[PDB]
Design a protein. Structure first.
Ligand SMILES: Cc1nc2c(s1)c1cnn(Cc3ccc(O)cc3)c(=O)c1n2C
Ligand SMILES: O=P(O)(O)OC[C@H]1O[C@](O)(COP(=O)(O)O)[C@@H](O)[C@@H]1O
Ligand SMILES: O=P(O)(O)OC[C@H]1O[C@](O)(COP(=O)(O)O)[C@@H](O)[C@@H]1O
Ligand SMILES: O=P(O)(O)OC[C@H]1O[C@](O)(COP(=O)(O)O)[C@@H](O)[C@@H]1O
Ligand SMILES: O=P(O)(O)OC[C@H]1O[C@](O)(COP(=O)(O)O)[C@@H](O)[C@@H]1O
Ligand SMILES: [K+]
Ligand SMILES: [K+]
Ligand SMILES: [Mn+2]
Ligand SMILES: [Mn+2]
Ligand SMILES: [Mn+2]
Ligand SMILES: [Mn+2]
Lengths: 446, 509, 468, 515
């Protein structure tokens, strides 16, 4: 079973290797990946990526999260950016089976001798020399309030140095902002040393390599990146790799060999999301940069050694009596046995999708939700493909479950994620409401 | 408890160092016990005590006894077994297996002069002239299968003779080990390609008897080739299509052609008695472990047999070697262990069943589960069969929650067998309407069969849930489940076998 | 290929099992040493010669029966049988002599002498745990051993009779003491003290016979030279279905510690009366070798039975097959990982030589040693290649039988004038010995382990040589 | 710890990652050799002295440009810079000289600065009619490779000028290939052509390569980077042009196109090593697939025990800037973690403004990456994958590496004539430095290809007794290691020698304490 032609795509020969060395030796440039790209793409909004028509092209190219850099720009500037992103996003809502949710992330200005990205020794950086600035500014507080008022999904918190820095952020978001995800940016030596306590109170991490590369020796950034990716992977919390991934594409139509390798290796490290800064904020090829990250991620996701990664994630995760976790790991294992084209999961808060994503299945996790915010926020979790369901409930709940599953199948077919004859794993619960996921089924498509 | 520190170890060496004589087993015994029926074990009262002690499969040795004798054994077994049918929540199915006589080469008191000279003839005139320097055998082709230098063992391999010459009179032999030969006693032709028929005529009448009396399993003696298995299945006829054929590997050719035999069998018996004569005794453990390992790989049941607790025929306690042999068979991966003389004729048949049960529980907890499961996972090929996909998903889920059990609904047993091959720590509670399948699934380690008796409900989904609740209630009464426990439930999307495709995580109430 | 080498190269333990082959023939060199108990069936010089040829490496003197004069006769007959082969040095097999202590023993319903009231020698299991009395039973006899598993006992860690027996062993130059019913580290120190300064070179093997010994195993092992899993008494002290747990635990911890371990009792019991063992008994011997046992033991099979030599031959035949079936790939990896890093050039050289031998499927590792330590550090990493140890010390040649896979050759010639020449002559003596014994053939690779200067403690050199 | 040893001891790769420590400084010497391309920014004797001190191990001469006299000047200044350290033999660093051939090329025709625009969606004809050699324009391009009309089927593509312009063959006709412009651009004269996925008929050697290869032999270059190697016969043609006098020269095959990737195994078997020529590879196959080819090729050379080089744009931004980008520093680190024996600088040292700082950056990155290797799984997999062998040099090598790990040996000192004994130690990736003592100056330079080998040139004449000569070179290796910081008093070393003179008889491993 499993056709001979199907077994030579998606780097499946390298997938069945008994050793990592053989896994490397069997990687094949003719082995084509699936269309579903698991690693989400964060694009920074700026002069080059602010118009509604430009944003439409970046959505089709693969942008999942739009980053607002509050280091620059008035609230009126950012309100117009949010208005333009939402206009381009909703411009596709007339076609539910192809609609792509897009999250909006607010990046704080933060606490802002080296000058000019650390280019001249004596933006300004003071490495080692511990300085005084508090966790949250008084302009940060006004910016975060702007985030709640305009309904942003994610906060990128700059220069997080300790757990209390995160709590100050969460306090500024307020009770109405309790649902916003907080990604703590690790930007200096202190944040690295206090990483374990920062991660426990955050929803995720951004390896902010720009400032980190000035605050610590440039030779050491990859050590910090691979440490933080593994620790969030172990913790099952999303991790973002950022800064200068395709830097030369600011002026050039094609990246360097080091840049494509950097995106690929960030994906192989286990990063949930990869980021573009000047490549989309200022550069001359914002859409091409998005297209390049999409293409590399597809290749690198197939080149992950899932065999060992799944085993180690399984051994490191503690035993659980939560039926959502138990169902998730079983569905992921079941998906590996059949190379299921997808895991289709129903979720309202996104947790069931995240618990599937944390075991890193090869199969795409197609998440059908009625919550527009959850559809935006699950882009943080690798391999989750969110579908916004818009119909009012069927009268029998079981019929309403089945129709959402069918909606996931129909959207997967249209997008090239699913074909007739594919096996799919379907994850649901035994009753409506969040928290009751406990069922895994094996279905053939059509 | 249950050797959890040893099972979590990073290495096998540390797993060994963490084994704990004070850590008590709490899981139910998963290795099935086969007990040979004989004079010590034909009492209905004794059979009831053997059921409660742990007997899962009753073996009828057709090497001896008439059809009427075995019909009585069958009737006493079923009476003892059905005596528990009034409480369906605790009723234990018990399989009945027919072990065939098989091709038995036989001779014609006279002493075998060690180092002497004895000839073994084929001529029919010498069938009654047996003595110190004449032996006759009913196998005519013995003269064409054992060359010069090959050996001929007699009476359980304690008297040996080597071929020195070949000639018209017969085979010219010399006595290697001495003894005195009786009247028509067992002969073995080690290493030689014995081309006796794959089925005696006695075997064909016995297999017809077994079909007529509804036996669940055939232990097929001296299986050397795939065609030997097909000969057995032919004699069962398609009236015996549902009977499971377990092939007894008993000689050198069977070990060599094992893979061809396993492919056409439902399982294997490591018949160490005959095998220990047909090949050197010091090589039997190699063949045992090879066969157990490859049946584990193929997901097919394997039985370890013969002399596991031999001294308990006359003594109330086993030796240290016998204790270790039973334990190491479980550690090897054997689905079933067997008692022969210990239950057929010995003085402590119940105590022998109790011992095997007690040893099996300790060994099952001493298994290095971490490496076993990982290796069975990677070795089992990718599959698009939904029952296969659900089974491995279910075993994975059971490990994550430390599930008390995996409840599975099954018509033929296959869905339980596909769970069993991944060796979950959780018990596989199999709920079936098929009384025969309830008995036959004892061959698969870790499956606990429950026979469902109620007639079908009007709504199919109501009938599914009733069966699931039947497994819940049986599990609670037998000690497998507690309130607050998590269980994995495996079902299908439509009636009939072959459509298993659902795995659920449920809390017990 | 032979030696189960296809199974040796499997990537998983499951495939290792799957590839085992009854037609794959093993190497003549048998690594697991055989201990045979001396008794009426194994006492004549002519019978001991047959058991030496059959494969007996250590002679066990059971000091629970027989007088001091009786055991001197046994010692004298063993040394006469052993030295009867000394005239051919290339084939001389050293044999060690082990003293097994009586230990704390309680010998012989109303227990306070017939079949209604039983007298005992100490203020309940009798007949090797076959009869149960409680303040379940069978048929008794006269003079019986009594086990009391549970309530704690007032017998000392070393009796006066035991002390007298230990001093007998020093005076008669035994190589090994099997210390009965060791429960604590203090019990071993008591044996080391009764052996005195004149007996400081004797190896103390602690016998684990009860629940307390299992519990305090780590502290007992740390002060012992090795361990005997005494399954006879241990099988009466703890439930019979749990002895296999204690055996495998103890064999694993000794293998990790690098100290020898003995598996004993009823391994081939039915051969006391029958010429062939049962299927369970050959499995128990094979599984003891697969567990990692350095030595296997025969007691009644050689002491009192009617087939003592055939019993030695059976253990020899099984051990060879089981040794080849060991999954060295995973065992060596796990031994390397668990052993701490070392700055000792002897241990550093040892693990390199074992690795090198696996790479070339070397027929043997030839090591020069005086105390035996260089050979033990090789044995510790469980190579498939035979460890041929050439030594001038007769005692080391006997005692090194405790370590699995060490084949001792006693070298007798005075030193050559150039020490480099004296080294080569001893290496050559091992090569010639291995050729005659069938360990080596022309074209084989061997690993030669020596040191850079004379005297113990300087092993630091590993050489790859092809046999001419 | 230091050395990232808590991470290397971890039981899983996941926990190994979590335990990487930015505050754990490396103490072992840098094992991945650095190749620096010689050019205007690196041709002066004093600048080359700076780069040798910064860590340059191999000097790359790019015969794609420059005259024979130009490259002979490059060789003279390199050798003058290298030999200015020879007066202190205990610290003299051999520096290899590698010749990178221009290789077979396909180029367009001459239309001065005359330029034309190939418009997107246009119709352009590619012809090799010698009458069209000069008649280039916006709908017609000539190329100097006549078999182009046979190797590019309809729907196949033709790239021009570093892949800036893309053409798709629509029909095969008598005049040539009629193509539609897929990606437009401005076309100059004599621009390079690439035929992605095509089986290119060009010989393994251009006629200029033959001349350059003889120049290399006559000037004693140590290494050849053979361009555009697509099959075993290409390597054979390179070998033949070097002749018997160039038989000691090492041949590193540059894998540059799709065929070379697919036929990698037959190429590697007849090669001394491989270069992942990512620059050309990224034009010949999709850019997002290059990392697949890099990791496959590094793994298969790791498995075969043959050196592998990763090249192109590793620190590209440092051509104009004193600090690399975050992507570039990660690219160097990940090439080392892949298992690359060498890393390369091209424009960063040939023409950039910071050549010495680029060499310093690669040295500092590689030192961090080498300690961040999950050594436990790497050595275990290399060990089990390496087959059984009855060759005593192979047996001694794995024995020495195992012993080095057991004692955390500071170094493995090995005596070698050709370098093979050092290479056999290097293939098992020990963390101990492999200190190779040789009398051959060429072998000393060439073993820089093998990761973890640190060559020392022995200059003394042979002692009377051979056993004295061996011990002298061993002590020379010890005294060199002490002076260079490899070895301290009280350290343990693994010394690897043989039983008789001449190469091929390595069979002894010794454990020694230093001083
Ligand atoms: C999901 C996983 N990712 C990795 C794994 S598992 C792994 C395991 N081992 N090693 C070291 C090694 C081993 C063999 C080689 O040929 C090269 C490197 C790795 O680097 C390595 N990675 C990056
Ligand atoms: O991931 P979440 O937020 O816990 O939601 C999972 C829930 O979705 C469902 O599948 C469907 O629930 P709804 O019909 O209320 O959307 C439930 O069975 C399950 O509890
Ligand atoms: O294990 P088997 O023999 O394939 O049978 C499993 C079958 O049992 C069921 O759960 C119920 O079967 P029935 O209702 O026909 O008894 C099916 O859904 C499933 O196909
Ligand atoms: O194992 P031991 O007792 O430490 O002896 C090993 C010793 O044997 C030798 O190989 C030879 O020593 P001798 O010549 O004194 O017997 C030494 O080089 C080495 O130190
Ligand atoms: O690595 P290579 O080229 O095979 O050479 C290793 C050789 O080096 C030697 O030490 C030779 O020493 P010489 O330089 O004196 O010839 C031999 O022992 C060994 O055969
Ligand atoms: K039978
Ligand atoms: K070039
Ligand atoms: Mn920053
Ligand atoms: Mn039989
Ligand atoms: Mn005892
Ligand atoms: Mn090129």
């Amino acid at each position: 079973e499993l056709g001979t032609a199907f077994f030579q795509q998606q780097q499946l020969p390298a997938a069945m290797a008994d050793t990592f060395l053989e896994h490397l030796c069997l990687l094949d440039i003719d082995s084509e990946p699936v269309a579903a790209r698991s690693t989400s793409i964060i694009a920074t909004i700026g002069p080059a990526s602010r118009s509604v028509e430009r944003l439409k092209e970046m959505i089709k190219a693969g942008m999942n999260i739009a980053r607002l850099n509050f280091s620059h720009g008035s609230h009126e500037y950012h309100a117009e950016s949010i208005a333009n992103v939402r206009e381009a996003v909703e411009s596709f809502a007339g076609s539910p089976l192809s609609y792509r949710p897009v999250a909006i992330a607010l990046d704080t200005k933060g606490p802002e001798i080296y000058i000019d990205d650390g280019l001249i020794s004596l933006g300004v950086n003071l490495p080692g020399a511990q300085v005084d600035l508090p966790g949250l500014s008084e302009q940060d507080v006004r910016d975060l309030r702007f985030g709640v008022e305009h309904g942003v999904d994610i906060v990128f918190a700059s220069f997080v140095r300790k757990a209390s820095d995160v709590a100050a952020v969460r306090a500024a978001l307020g009770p109405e902002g309790h649902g916003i995800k907080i990604i703590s940016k690790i930007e200096n030596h202190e944040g690295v040393k206090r990483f374990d306590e920062i991660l426990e109170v955050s929803d995720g991490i951004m390896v902010a390599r720009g400032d980190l590369g000035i605050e610590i020796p440039a030779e050491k950034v990859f050590l910090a990146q691979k440490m933080m990716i593994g620790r969030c992977n172990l913790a099952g919390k999303p991790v973002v790799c950022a800064t200068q991934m395709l830097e030369s594409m600011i002026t050039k139509p094609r990246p360097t060999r080091a840049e494509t390798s950097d995106v690929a290796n960030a994906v192989l490290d286990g990063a949930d999301c990869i980021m573009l800064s000047g490549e989309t904020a200022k550069g001359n090829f914002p859409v091409e940069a998005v297209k390049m990250q999409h293409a590399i991620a597809r290749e690198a996701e197939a080149a992950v050694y899932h065999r060992q990664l799944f085993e180690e994630l399984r051994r490191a995760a503690p035993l659980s009596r939560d039926p959502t976790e138990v169902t998730a790991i079983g569905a992921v294992e079941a998906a590996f046995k059949c190379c299921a084209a997808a895991i289709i999961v129903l979720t309202t808060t996104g947790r069931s999708a995240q618990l599937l994503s944390r075991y890193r299945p090869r199969a795409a996790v197609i998440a059908v939700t009625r919550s527009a915010q959850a559809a935006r926020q699950v882009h943080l979790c690798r391999g989750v493909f969110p579908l916004l369901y818009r119909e009012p409930p069927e009268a029998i709940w079981a019929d309403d479950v089945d129709r959402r599953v069918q909606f996931g199948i129909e959207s997967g077919k249209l997008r090239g994620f699913l074909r007739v004859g594919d096996l799919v794993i379907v994850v649901t619960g035994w009753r409506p409401g969040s928290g009751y996921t406990n069922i895994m089924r094996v279905l053939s498509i059509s």
